[PDB]
Amino acid sequence: SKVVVPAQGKKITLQNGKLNVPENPIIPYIEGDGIGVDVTPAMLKVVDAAVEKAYKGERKISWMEIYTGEKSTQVYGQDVWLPAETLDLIREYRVAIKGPLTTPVGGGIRSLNVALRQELDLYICLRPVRYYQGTPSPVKHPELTDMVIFRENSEDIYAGIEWKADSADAEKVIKFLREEMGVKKIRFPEHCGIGIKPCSEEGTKRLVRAAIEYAIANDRDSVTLVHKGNIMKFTEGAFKDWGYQLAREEFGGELIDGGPWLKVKNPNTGKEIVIKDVIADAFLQQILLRPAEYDVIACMNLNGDYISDALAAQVGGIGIAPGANIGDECALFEATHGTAPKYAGQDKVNPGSIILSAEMMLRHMGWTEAADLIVKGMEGAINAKTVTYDFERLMDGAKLLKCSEFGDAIIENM
Amino acid sequence: SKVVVPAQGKKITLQNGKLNVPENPIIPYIEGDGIGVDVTPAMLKVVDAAVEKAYKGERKISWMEIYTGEKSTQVYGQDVWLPAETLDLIREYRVAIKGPLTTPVGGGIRSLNVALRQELDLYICLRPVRYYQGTPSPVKHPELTDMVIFRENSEDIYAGIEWKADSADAEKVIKFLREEMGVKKIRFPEHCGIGIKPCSEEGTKRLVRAAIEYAIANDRDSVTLVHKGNIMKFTEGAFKDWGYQLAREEFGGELIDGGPWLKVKNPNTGKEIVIKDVIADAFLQQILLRPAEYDVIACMNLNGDYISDALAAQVGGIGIAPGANIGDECALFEATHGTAPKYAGQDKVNPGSIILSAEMMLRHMGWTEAADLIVKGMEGAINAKTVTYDFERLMDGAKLLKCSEFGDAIIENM
Ligand SMILES: O=C(O)CCC(=O)C(=O)O
Numbered sequence: 001s002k003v004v005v006p007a008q009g010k011k012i013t014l015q016n017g018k019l020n021v022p023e024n025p026i027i028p029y030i031e032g033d034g035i036g037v038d039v040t041p042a043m044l045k046v047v048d049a050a051v052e053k054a055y056k057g058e059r060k061i062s063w064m065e066i067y068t069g070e071k072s073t074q075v076y077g078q079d080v081w082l083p084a085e086t087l088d089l090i091r092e093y094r095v096a097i098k099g100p101l102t103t104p105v106g107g108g109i110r111s112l113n114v115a116l117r118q119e120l121d122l123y124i125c126l127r128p129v130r131y132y133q134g135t136p137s138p139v140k141h142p143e144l145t146d147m148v149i150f151r152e153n154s155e156d157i158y159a160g161i162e163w164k165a166d167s168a169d170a171e172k173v174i175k176f177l178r179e180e181m182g183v184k185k186i187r188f189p190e191h192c193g194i195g196i197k198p199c200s201e202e203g204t205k206r207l208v209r210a211a212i213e214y215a216i217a218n219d220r221d222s223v224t225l226v227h228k229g230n231i232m233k234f235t236e237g238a239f240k241d242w243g244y245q246l247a248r249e250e251f252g253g254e255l256i257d258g259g260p261w262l263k264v265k266n267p268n269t270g271k272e273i274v275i276k277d278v279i280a281d282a283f284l285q286q287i288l289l290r291p292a293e294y295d296v297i298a299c300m301n302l303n304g305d306y307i308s309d310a311l312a313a314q315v316g317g318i319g320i321a322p323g324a325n326i327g328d329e330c331a332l333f334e335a336t337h338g339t340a341p342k343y344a345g346q347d348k349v350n351p352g353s354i355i356l357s358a359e360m361m362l363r364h365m366g367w368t369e370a371a372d373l374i375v376k377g378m379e380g381a382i383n384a385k386t387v388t389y390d391f392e393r394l395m396d397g398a399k400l401l402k403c404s405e406f407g408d409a410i411i412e413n414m
Numbered sequence: 415s416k417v418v419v420p421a422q423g424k425k426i427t428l429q430n431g432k433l434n435v436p437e438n439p440i441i442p443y444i445e446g447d448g449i450g451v452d453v454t455p456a457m458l459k460v461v462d463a464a465v466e467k468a469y470k471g472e473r474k475i476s477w478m479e480i481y482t483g484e485k486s487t488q489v490y491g492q493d494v495w496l497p498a499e500t501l502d503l504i505r506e507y508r509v510a511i512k513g514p515l516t517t518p519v520g521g522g523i524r525s526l527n528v529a530l531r532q533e534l535d536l537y538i539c540l541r542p543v544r545y546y547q548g549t550p551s552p553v554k555h556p557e558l559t560d561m562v563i564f565r566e567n568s569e570d571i572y573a574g575i576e577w578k579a580d581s582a583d584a585e586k587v588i589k590f591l592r593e594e595m596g597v598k599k600i601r602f603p604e605h606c607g608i609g610i611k612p613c614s615e616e617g618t619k620r621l622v623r624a625a626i627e628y629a630i631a632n633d634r635d636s637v638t639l640v641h642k643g644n645i646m647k648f649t650e651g652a653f654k655d656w657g658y659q660l661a662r663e664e665f666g667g668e669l670i671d672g673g674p675w676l677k678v679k680n681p682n683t684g685k686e687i688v689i690k691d692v693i694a695d696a697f698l699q700q701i702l703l704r705p706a707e708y709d710v711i712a713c714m715n716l717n718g719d720y721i722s723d724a725l726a727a728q729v730g731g732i733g734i735a736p737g738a739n740i741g742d743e744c745a746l747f748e749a750t751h752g753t754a755p756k757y758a759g760q761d762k763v764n765p766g767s768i769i770l771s772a773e774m775m776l777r778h779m780g781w782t783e784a785a786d787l788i789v790k791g792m793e794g795a796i797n798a799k800t801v802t803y804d805f806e807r808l809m810d811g812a813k814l815l816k817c818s819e820f821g822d823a824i825i826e827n828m
């Protein structure tokens with residue numbers, strides 16, 4: 001095992017769904033491939049400064065490197081891309097952070113980000129998107145976007161259940177569908193690839209339960225179930241209907257005049273929360289035209305994959321969008337962008353995706369005060385037009401900063 | 415049969431993939447449900463005026479109403495939503511136009527727009543999107559968007575091959591996948607719905623063939639295959655690879671330095687056309703940030719469904735986006751928006767989606783001169799800030815017009 005546990009840290013423990021976070025917690029981190037070598041050192045500098053400015057010395061994180069991706073073959077052997085040890089270790093230390101990851105081609109494995117998500121049963125991909133004043137945006141009014149995506153991570157088409165065209169197994173599957181199930185709707189059965197998309201009662205409800213609980217705790221105004229439920233009646237329509245049934249049964253929602261929309265009342269607050277639904281293709285237009293009407297969004301794995309990237313772009317956040325995959329027994333926060341090898345080692349890219357996922361991390365842990373400091377920091381740096389090439393390209397009069405230098409500018413504005 | 419063929423028209427005939435369009439062609443049209451009662455009369459006024467201003471009297475269309483949707487039950491019986499007669503008739507008269515359509519709930523049928531597409535084997539959904547100067551847009555620079563989507567219409571998840579959770583058939587399908595195929599990747603097998611997504615060699619290639627032929631005839635600069643090919647290796651990755659193989663083999667494309675991008679040379683023109691690919695979620699960001707780098711887009715059925723609505727929105731075109739479903743033996747042009755019953759009969763909505771799909775219609779037919787007139791018309795009306803409520807809501811100083819009045823304003827600016 002080649003991980004070295006810090007000598008002075010202590011482990012987070014989970015007691016009754018609530019975290020027990022010590023003053024010296026050990027947090028494992030995965031450096032990441034590609035530009036992970038640039039953004040990750042900046043996020044450690046900055047999380048470390050945010051806990052010192054905040055808790056004035058009492059709290060310290062003991063960071064612990066663990067491995068996945070190309071940096072793990074360089075450490076464990078040519079063919080070890082996801083060591084079982086990292087899975088045990090994220091479950092054991094309960095909270096962790098990672099940078100971008102390379103999956104090699106063909107060679108068995110799925111996509112390492114999905115493999116972690118699924119193997120560790122991290123069913124909530126929580127990706128909030130919000131505007132930071134100052135970001136170059138391609139949209140006229142990007143400040144209307146404050147949204148939070150709850151993307152179901154354990155099923156949908158992402159389960160990887162598929163077969164290559166013309167292989168024996170694909171043909172078996174199609175002899176099955178035609179002969180045993182009476183399926184006449186395949187246009188070209190020869191030279192045809194097949195994939196299976198599953199959507200289940202427990203899988204959508206644990207996600208929507210999470211989404212409506214997230215709305216109540218943070219006093220948000222609506223939850224939108226988005227779906228292409230009119231073509232995919234039983235995976236995606238069932239997703240809309242189960243989500244409505246969950247808000248009636250467990251949250252006591254009741255009809256708004258004709259319906260279908262339900263109103264769930266916030267028990268801590270009195271405000272009513274709307275549970276509504278939008279067909280998925282009209283949603284991608286609604287988020288650009290009426291973006292103030294939407295808030296928490298709940299969806300299956302593929303739709304959420306796309307909604308979040310569309311949303312991140314309109315607010316000018318391709319490179320600063322945060323992300324977290326959360327399950328019942330642990331969480332893994334991540335940079336949402338790729339590895340970008342062209343720019344690796346050159347200290348120029350924007351480190352704000354992983355830093356803002358460290359914000360989510362701390363907030364999860366309960367160190368709200370360090371986490372609000374990291375967003376005070378980043379709102380200052382961007383507003384001082386002090387920024388990395390990606391934002392400098394598009395801006396009228398800014399100071400170009402290296403990636404390390406931008407972490408310092410965040411510490412500077414706390 | 416309750417269709418009445420015009421006394422004076424003549425039928426378009428197809429000879430060697432080329433259309434023979436007489437001076438008096440009969441064109442069937444479907445009025446549409448909901449606001450189809452408002453926009454369709456405006457499109458007939460305007461196509462009729464555009465052929466008279468253009469061909470000064472020699473050419474006349476003989477319009478022929480046919481039926482699908484709610485207006486067909488009112489004509490054929492409570493349960494007749496898609497008369498076999500309309501399918502025979504679109505195939506027979508070769509070209510047709512429709513407004514928005516209602517599909518009832520549950521009661522068997524799929525979604526009538528898809529049922530036509532599929533039953534009539536209309537494999538190309540061609541949806542071009544372009545900015546008309548003057549449209550209220552939510553994006554800063556919407557004029558950079560000139561794109562053309564080629565969406566595969568006959569397969570992908572849209573084939574409707576799916577089973578309800580807990581039904582006997584779904585369980586059969588899962589006893590099959592676990593027991594016979596060795597599938598361990600379903601998270602919750604009980605209470606699970608299943609859908610099948612097929613993607614085939616002939617289906618993607620007839621679409622990409624069409625897309626690269628469309629690029630060469632119109633002198634466009636690139637074709638982008640978009641796909642989530644890294645999770646769906648065999649439906650969607652195969653889509654990327656077959657599309658590349660088609661441009662090497664049939665169009666003689668050759669590598670750009672490292673590749674993967676191929677360059678196909680336009681035989682009529684000398685310009686080189688780039689065939690490139692973008693993973694689908696990065697595409698939804700690339701279209702908002704670098705929109706000038708993309709042009710003709712080729713994709714499977716679900717991705718295209720979403721790309722086009724995202725694109726239509728950024729240029730301010732929710733209600734003016736044109737559409738066409740094209741096959742080898744006929745075409746059916748359509749309004750892309752819904753029925754909107756709230757506003758039906760009130761003459762207020764925007765008729766520019768079906769009118770701009772009539773533009774595509776004429777262009778297809780070869781009446782280029784009437785078709786360029788209809789876009790001269792619509793660029794004048796919008797630029798004279800003379801417009802329907804949807805655009806008047808968002809605009810600084812315009813004349814509000816009824817839907818019929820807006821068709822007149824288009825005739826006025828030809
Ligand atoms: O990079 C990958 O592993 C694909 C994942 C992806 O788009 C994501 O997590 O959003």
Ligand SMILES: O=C(O)CCC(=O)C(=O)O
Pocket residue numbers: 281525526527528719
């Ligand atoms: O209205 C329908 O039939 C669904 C179709 C749809 O979004 C479309 O054709 O783009």
Ligand SMILES: [Mg+2]
Pocket residue numbers: 305309695
């Ligand atoms: Mg993604």
Ligand SMILES: [Mg+2]
Pocket residue numbers: 281719723
């Ligand atoms: Mg659509």
